Design a protein around this nucleic acid. Structure first.
Lengths: 333, 49, 422, 27, 640, 158
RNA sequence: CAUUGGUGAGCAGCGAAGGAUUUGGUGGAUUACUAGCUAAUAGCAAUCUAUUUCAAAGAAUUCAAACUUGGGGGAAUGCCUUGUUGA
């Protein structure tokens, strides 16, 4: 440990990467282990590519692409000291950021570096993709959030959302809200279409390590061993501001929706299971899924993502998604 | 208290008969189908090619 | 624990979820009537239609099957799924299934039972979830082809590990391997619980008792040399015998007689346990066939007793209970038959009981002694008590008729008792 | 094969306990 | 009685003296508090690792132990101490000479029952105070009210009621008002144990004749009766894991488990603890767990666990029998011999009258282990002769250890009582060796020694012959025959050149080991009893029967120092590592330190119990001694 | 119907909101002090939430019979009759212990051709082709030699 | 004649209610023993979260930031630097 967890887009597979280098890919529902690597190395994060067949692991200095059975396919010599990984499913681009302060977009299909951008703000502390428009949000040690596209050498937007390093960034499915946490014990909910700050929970009991937003819109926050959830937090109304306790049962104040305490563990990362009422939590001793009623999207669309997807539907879906890959330069605000 | 969670009937999604096709649920949510303009442009470009 | 071991537990829990098509093909293929290729093509409506007709045929044989038509074989059960059910509902479903397997236990020879149970196997996946109950109810049909089909589609629980060899095998499991299942102490507790449920429900039938008896009897023989393991069997199987004796069914009582008799020969027990056994044997003794087997059982147990008090008189309550169920005339007939089993010790205890408690049968003592030859010491004990009777009880024509009988046969031993006593 | 008897690892689980401090009361 | 060179440090090898241990919960974790003579020790239930030991030894032996969260209450004589992390926080002194017997703490009330049927109630000065200190009132149970108090218990959901359990019957006292709320009906049999059930209003009572009663206090009526004829209940405990189980401990050393729902016996654990030492003094189910912790007077603490049922259905019926999980222990009787295993002070070797040899660790108690007596297969191939029923080797009179060849072959020799051969052990394997050394002259083994190189083992017979074996191959190599009486000491210098022997005939023989020649012979006035050879200085001291210690220089074969002052036999003595002091113990209940350069006694001690062994650590930091009473080893710190 | 009543519990009045653990007892947010009778009933309910009430406590109580055999099994733990009282030895199990060898004290120089115990005294006689009649006092622990008699040129076949 | 080659048939000798070989699981050690959780000068351990919010403090022209590249030759279009044009 500690263990970083990343579920597949359709929620059928779980990818786990321990810090000391234990990487495993498994179908958690049927308990089948697709691959298990015991790399004697420091692994920071891993992500699935277009589907469960391939996944990427950010090791000590280089990122490696692996096969379904765990066979190494490529060593990405260009990506150096990557600490965060993200995959744009519609563009087939793999994104990395780390201690070099360099944002690199890599096309998995053709295997050519689409673009490498210099952030100029030192090491990158957080990363989150805007699923609506595929714009990457990076937090830095100066406390700003920068929006990036592969086709612009300079950031599209710069947002000052903290007085210290931004620990984590979360963006909702609709790409309308953003939630950022900083080392200054503050959580800020943003309106990224109009770039207006909505809420600012100025003082938290301890700095919030991670934030995640579900399909339904639940806001998840982790503070060391604690995991706290809020419902309807992402709204323009002032009453929707998160609070930890209602003062004398005031109806307007928005108390936590759910809470859970991992007694002796520091939470590593949070991931909502895509189409289930579950929240995955990676921690020092392993992984735990918390039952969160109302967390996930009840109604999925089979054309885009299908949890009951067969191999024949998979290899057909792989080609048509590859035929209509969106060009990288299409990415705009 | 009142607890309810997303609950999938496997028979509604995985047919019992081996000869039956699999059900394909459809949700026309825009949030589930991003890049409507970009995707159609590429399909237009592929059709032209 | 390695990650694979933890993932293995996850797979077992989600065995019947039917996540994808390959899982559906495996789960839906399992059948008791059809081969795998044909089974996967079928539909629940096709399966349910046939099962409904089968339940009607079973209903004609036995009205009790008509109840499940409202609950398990309803048209609304077609759209019922267990994975989507809450825990209270699943427990509640299992009780209904377990009750059905009890009723179906005795009709497996009939063809319709195989069709009706196909619905539960396909709809409710009893072969995966309720696997122990299904195996137990069909254990005595092990030579039948139906048991072979069950083994093919079932995953054996840990306690049924010996049957793993015969899963998908041409030869049916041998009768010798059933001793091995019952040899285990954990399995005996499980079978005891199942057999207890049948007795509570009066669902027991002769074929069940016979197979149950042979396995229990053979388990003693296999452990005869190991006295320590025999001791661990006593709490279990004698507790079973008590339950069988309590049952009003005579066939259950006769099985208890068989089980008790083998134990007494296999392992010597306290006379207190033997006397308690009579109290249970005689308390619920009403059937004539049970009455006949009980008397042979009672005679045999006293034969096993080999300690001081071997031939002492029965307790007051015990003797009164025995006489009511076996009047003096019946035992005289029991001794009269030339093929009587060895019962001298019981008659010696019975004879001393008469003198202590009922003087009027003192004439019967004379008839009893002529019919059966008692051993040298046993006659000495009877003489000793009758000598006390003369000192205490008034002299009687029958009482002197007993002494003169001992005068006629072995006069000298009569003097030795008198010399030692007065 | 005879029945397999493994001794599985056991790790303690937290349990709720009644606190006797609520019983005391002052007039 | 106070030494200027030595000060007590702690006791080694003792886990419990037989007083019922106390269990307390901190969060989800549990800990066990066990009594050890005048001190108590706290173990972690998960690992049975020692956590804390009482800072100071109580003036009198502890009688009761109760633990609630961080605080631990220990009762001794007429005083009740309150301890936190082993350090006393407050001492409650009762105002009557009657000694405390039983102790109960519920909420802000502390109840202490003296042997004169008087119950003292102490209350918290403030509601938020951590522990009770203020004296509230005194409640006395008269003979008319009930018999001798068996135990004090508090049932849940009872406001200010104390359930006093007496031999005759049970009583309900309201501590706040000090009035008798309720008196139970008299019981025909004497009550010996009480335990509150996890159910409401019901307390399990154990009688002297194998009867357990589920007495209901609210209804004041019997609910159930378990019968265990010809047995005495010593402990009771309920399973709170969701299974209605009841564990009944007995003075016979057996632990029975009942299924209350099914009215059946799950299993019986036979002879878990010795009947001679009180059997099962305490057996408690850990709250909400399937683990049960058992203790007894045999200096042992064990844990048993119930595994999940193997049947997928009817798990209630198919109950796995309890399995041994972990335990800690020590000698059941005082150690007879001790020795330091290594140059550093890590491990000590101990042997006791209970026919068991132990390796005790000073640095951590968990490392302490018992050396196996499993015998190796004979090299020749013949069947080894012995009783099929397995028995431990006889008591160990002597022991010799070296570490030159540890891990290569046997490196310990031991002598047994009334036995004509010496057994070898292996410290690395912690198991009895594969060689046995015989005297070859029909005499018992009286002395054992080993060369520094670790190759030779010397055996001294009661008939006066010294046989020399090779440790690697166990082949007899040499036999020296000078003494006509028993040889009570053998030693060889570090150089493996000059060998020295002593015997009851009073002569001291000097041999050249390599040349096998008699260098010289020295006669002393009285029979010699023991020998200690200091290899660095080539000096060895001899304990004579005239109550003297005679120091001799092997190089010159002359007496250099003679020590006088002991009033009785010298049980043991040892050299200091620097070779400058000798510490000796005698039957007159004294330990004296002697300064060899000046040849005079510089320090003196008076031990309550005669010290049977004395041993310096090779470092010199510690001095270890064993006493005629007590199962442990007293460790002293060398202030010099 | 409780056998006893305590009046102090009716008069006692306790605050709930002081300690955190007691806070869950409140039926409503407005109430802050309750008498002992209501306080106890709330504690009992909370106690049940921690320890659910089992079957054996409530529905069951102890307060020719068919169940005689079951009762005696519960009472008795050892089901095999003690062999000390019985005079007849068990069929297949022999309780036999070895003692010290008789000839250990004074060994014989040939095979033991015949043995004989003295009818009354505790003596054992040995003989062989060594032509010696050795008598031992068999006690089971020492077995010392009472006497010997060498018969020159007289082998002892019996 | 020799096998320090295999496979067997048997003695002498050893020899206490049997002996020999292999193996699954768990427990204790493998560093030297000061107890669990939290928002931690104290609470909790049955948690509170119906006081948990306010106030105070807190923003370097460092407005710098790949110390992180296998070698040789280039780099249309990109990217970096420098100037330049028009707003």
């Amino acid at each position: 440990g500690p263990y970083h967890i990343k579920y597949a887009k359709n929620g059928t597979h779980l990818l786990i990467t321990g810090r000391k280098g234990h990487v495993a890919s498994m179908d958690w529902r049927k308990g089948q282990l697709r691959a298990e690597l015991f790399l004697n190395e420091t692994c920071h994060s891993a992500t699935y590519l277009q589907n469960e067949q391939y996944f990427a692991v950010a090791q000590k200095k280089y990122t490696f692409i692996y096969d379904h059975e765990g066979t190494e396919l490529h060593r990405l010599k260009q990506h150096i000291e990557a600490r965060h990984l993200d995959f744009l499913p519609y563009h087939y681009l793999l994104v990395t950021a780390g201690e070099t302060g360099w944002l690199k977009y890599h096309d998995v299909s053709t295997g050519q570096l689409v673009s490498e951008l210099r952030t100029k703000a030192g090491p990158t502390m957080a990363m989150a993709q805007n699923p609506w428009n595929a714009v990457m949000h990076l937090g830095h040690s100066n406390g700003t959030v920068s929006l990036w596209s592969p086709s612009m050498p300079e950031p599209l937007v710069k947002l000052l959302s903290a007085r210290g390093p931004v620990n984590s960034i979360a963006i909702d499915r609709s790409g309308y809200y953003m939630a950022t946490t900083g080392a200054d014990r503050s959580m800020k909910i943003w309106d990224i279409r109009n770039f207006k700050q909505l809420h600012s929970v100025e003082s938290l009991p301890t700095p919030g390590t991670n934030v995640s937003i579900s399909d339904t819109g639940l806001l998840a926050l982790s503070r060391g061993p604690h995991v706290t959830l809020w419902k309807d937090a992402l709204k323009l109304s002032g009453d929707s501001k998160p609070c930890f306790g209602s003062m004398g049962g005031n109806p307007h104040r928005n108390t936590p929706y759910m809470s859970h305490l991992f007694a002796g563990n520091k939470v590593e990362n949070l991931g909502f299971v895509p189409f289930e009422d579950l929240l995955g939590v990676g921690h020092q001793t392993g992984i735990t899924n918390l039952i969160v009623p109302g967390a996930g999207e009840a109604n999925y669309d089979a054309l885009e993502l299908n949890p009951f997807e067969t191999k024949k539907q998979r290899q057909e879906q792989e080609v048509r998604t590859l035929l209509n890959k969106l060009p990288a330069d299409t990415i705009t605000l | 208290m009142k607890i309810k969670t997303i609950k999938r009937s496997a028979d509604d999604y995985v047919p019992v008969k081996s000869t039956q096709e699999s059900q394909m649920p459809r949700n026309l949510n825009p949030e589930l189908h991003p890049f409507e303009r970009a995707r159609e442009y590429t399909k237009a470009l592929n059709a032209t090619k | 624990s390695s990650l694979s071991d933890q993932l293995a537990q996850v797979a077992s829990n989600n065995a019947t979820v039917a996540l994808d098509r390959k899982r559906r093909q495996k789960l839906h293929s399992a059948s008791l009537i059809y081969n795998s290729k044909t089974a996967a093509t079928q539909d629940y409506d096709f399966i349910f239609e046939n099962a409904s007709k089968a339940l009607e045929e079973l209903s004609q044989i036995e009205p009790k099957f008509a109840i499940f038509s409202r609950t398990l074989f309803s048209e609304s059960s077609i759209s019922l799924d267990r994975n989507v059910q809450t825990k209270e509902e699943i427990k509640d479903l299992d009780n209904a299934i377990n009750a059905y397997l009890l009723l179906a236990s005795s009709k497996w020879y009939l063809a319709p039972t195989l069709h009706a149970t196909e619905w539960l196997v396909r709809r409710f996946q009893i072969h995966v979830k309720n696997t122990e109950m299904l195996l137990l109810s069909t254990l005595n049909y092990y030579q039948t082809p139906v048991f072979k089909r069950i083994l093919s589609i079932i995953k054996l629980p840990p306690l049924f590990n010996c049957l793993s060899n015969f899963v998908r095998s041409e030869k049916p499991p041998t009768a010798l391997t059933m001793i091995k299942l019952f040899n285990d102490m954990d399995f005996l507790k499980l079978y005891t619980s199942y057999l207890d449920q049948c007795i509570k429900h009066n669902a027991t039938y002769t074929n069940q008792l016979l197979f149950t008896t042979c396995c229990f009897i053979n388990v003693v023989a296999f452990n005869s040399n190991n006295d320590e393991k025999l001791n661990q069997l006593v709490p279990i199987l004698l507790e079973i015998s008590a339950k069988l004796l309590a049952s009003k069914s005579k066939d259950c009582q006769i099985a208890a007689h068989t089980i008790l008799v083998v134990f007494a020969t296999a392992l010597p027990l306290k006379k207190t346990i033997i006397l308690a056994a009579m109290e249970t044997i005689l308390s619920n003794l009403d059937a004539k066939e049970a009455k006949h087997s009980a008397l042979l059982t009672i005679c045999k147990l006293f034969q096993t007793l080999k300690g001081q008090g071997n031939v002492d008189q029965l307790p007051s309550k015990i003797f009164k209970l025995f006489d009511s169920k076996f009047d003096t005339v019946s035992i005289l007939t029991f001794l009269d038959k030339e093929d009587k089993p060895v019962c001298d010790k019981f008659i010696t205890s019975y004879t001393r009981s008469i003198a202590r408690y009922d003087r009027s049968k003192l004439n019967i003592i004379l008839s009893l002694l002529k019919k059966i030859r008692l051993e040298r010491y046993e006659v000495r004990l009877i003489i000793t008590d009758l000598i006390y009777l003369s000192e205490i009880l008034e002299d009687k024509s029958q009482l002197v008729e007993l002494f003169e009988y001992f005068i006629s046969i072995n006069e000298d031993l009569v003097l030795k008792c008198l010399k030692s006593l007065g | 094969p005879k029945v397999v008897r493994e001794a599985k690892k056991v790790e303690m689980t937290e349990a709720r306990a009644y606190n006797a401090d609520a019983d005391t009361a002052k007039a | 009685k106070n030494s200027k060179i030595f000060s007590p440090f702690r006791i080694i090898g003792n886990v419990s003296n037989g007083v019922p241990f106390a269990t307390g919960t901190l969060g989800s974790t549990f800990y066990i508090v066990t009594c050890v003579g005048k001190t108590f020790q706290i173990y972690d239930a998960n690992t049975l690792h020692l956590l804390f030991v009482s800072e100071k030894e109580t003036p009198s032996s502890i009688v009761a132990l109760s633990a609630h969260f961080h605080y631990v209450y220990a009762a001794y004589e007429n005083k009740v101490g309150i301890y936190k992390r082993g350090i006393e926080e407050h001492l409650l002194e009762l105002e009557t000479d009657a000694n405390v017997e039983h102790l109960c703490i519920f909420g802000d009330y502390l109840c202490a029952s003296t042997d004169d049927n008087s119950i003292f109630i102490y209350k918290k000065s403030d509601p938020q105070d951590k522990y009770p200190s203020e004296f509230y009132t005194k409640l006395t149970v008269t003979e008319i009210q009930g018999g001798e108090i068996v135990s004090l218990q508090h049932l849940a959901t009872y406001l200010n009621k104390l359930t006093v359990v007496t031999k005759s019957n049970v009583l309900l006292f309201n501590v706040r008002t000090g009035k008798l709320v309720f008196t139970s009906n008299e019981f025909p049999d004497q009550i010996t144990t009480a335990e509150p059930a996890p159910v409401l209003d019901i307390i399990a009572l154990g009688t002297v004749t194998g009867e357990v009663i589920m007495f209901n206090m609210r209804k004041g009526k019997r609910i159930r009766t378990i019968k265990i004829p010809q047995s005495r209940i010593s402990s009771l405990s309920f399973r709170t894991d969701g299974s209605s189980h009841l564990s009944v401990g007995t003075s016979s050393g057996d632990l029975i488990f009942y299924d209350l729902d099914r009215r059946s016996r799950i299993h019986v654990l036979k002879n878990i603890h010795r009947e001679s030492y009180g059997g099962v003094t305490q057996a408690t189910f850990l709250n909400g767990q399937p683990i049960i912790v058992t203790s007894g007077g045999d200096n042992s603490l064990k844990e048993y666990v119930f595994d999940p049922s193997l049947s997928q259905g009817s798990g209630d019926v198919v109950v796995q029998p309890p399995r041994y999980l972990r335990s800690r222990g020590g000698h059941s009787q005082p150690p007879s011999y001790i020795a330091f295993a290594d140059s550093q002070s890590h491990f000590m070797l101990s042997a006791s009258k209970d026919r068991s040899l132990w390796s005790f660790s000073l640095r951590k108690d968990a490392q302490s282990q018992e050396m196996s007596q499993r015998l190796h297969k004979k090299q020749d191939g013949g069947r080894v002769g012995g009783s099929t029923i397995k028995s431990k080797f006889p008591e160990i009179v002597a022991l010799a250890i070296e570490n030159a060849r540890i891990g290569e072959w046997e490196n310990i020799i031991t002598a047994h009582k009334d036995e004509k051969f010496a057994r070898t052990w292996d410290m690395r394997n912690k198991r009895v060796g594969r060689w046995t050394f015989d005297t070859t002259d029909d005499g018992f083994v009286k002395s054992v020694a080993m060369s520094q190189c670790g190759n030779f083992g010397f055996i001294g017979s009661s008939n006066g012959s010294i046989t020399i074996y090779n440790m690697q191959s166990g082949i007899l190599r040499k036999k020296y025959k000078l003494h006509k009486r028993a040889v009570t000491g053998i030693s060889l210098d570090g150089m493996n050149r000059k060998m020295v022997s002593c015997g009851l005939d009073g002569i001291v023989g000097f041999y050249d080991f390599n040349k096998s020649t008699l260098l010289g012979k020295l006669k002393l006035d009285a029979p010699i009893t023991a020998m200690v050879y200091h290899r660095s200085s080539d000096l060895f001291a001899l304990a004579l029967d005239d109550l003297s210690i005679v120091v001799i220089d092997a190089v010159t074969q002359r007496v250099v120092r003679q020590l006088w002052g002991h009033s009785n036999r010298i049980t043991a003595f040892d050299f200091s590592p620097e070779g400058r002091w000798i510490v000796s113990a005698s039957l007159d209940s004294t330990i004296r330190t002697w300064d060899l350069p000046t040849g005079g006694c510089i320090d003196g001690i008076i031990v309550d119990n005669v010290a049977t062994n004395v041993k310096f650590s090779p470092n010199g930091d510690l001095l270890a001694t064993t006493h005629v009473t007590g199962n442990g080893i007293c460790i002293w710190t060398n202030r010099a | 119907e409780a056998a006893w009543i305590d009046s102090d519990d009716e008069k006692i009045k306790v605050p709930i909101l002081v300690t955190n653990k007691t806070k869950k007892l409140r039926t409503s947010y407005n109430e802050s002090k309750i008498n002992g009778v209501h306080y106890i009933n709330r504690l009992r309910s909370q106690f049940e939430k921690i320890y659910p009430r089992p079957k054996w406590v409530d529905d069951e109580s102890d307060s020719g019979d068919i169940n005689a055999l079951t009762k005696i099994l519960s009472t008795t733990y050892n089901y095999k009759d003690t062999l000390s009282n019985s005079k007849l030895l068990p069929p297949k199990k022999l309780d036999i212990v070895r003692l010290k060898d008789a000839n250990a004290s004074h060994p014989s120089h040939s095979a033991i051709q015949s043995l004989s115990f003295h009818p009354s005294k505790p003596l054992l006689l040995t003989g062989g082709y060594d032509k010696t009649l050795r008598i031992y006092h068999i006690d089971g622990k020492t077995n010392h030699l009472v006497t010997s008699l060498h018969l020159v040129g007289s082998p002892i076949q019996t």
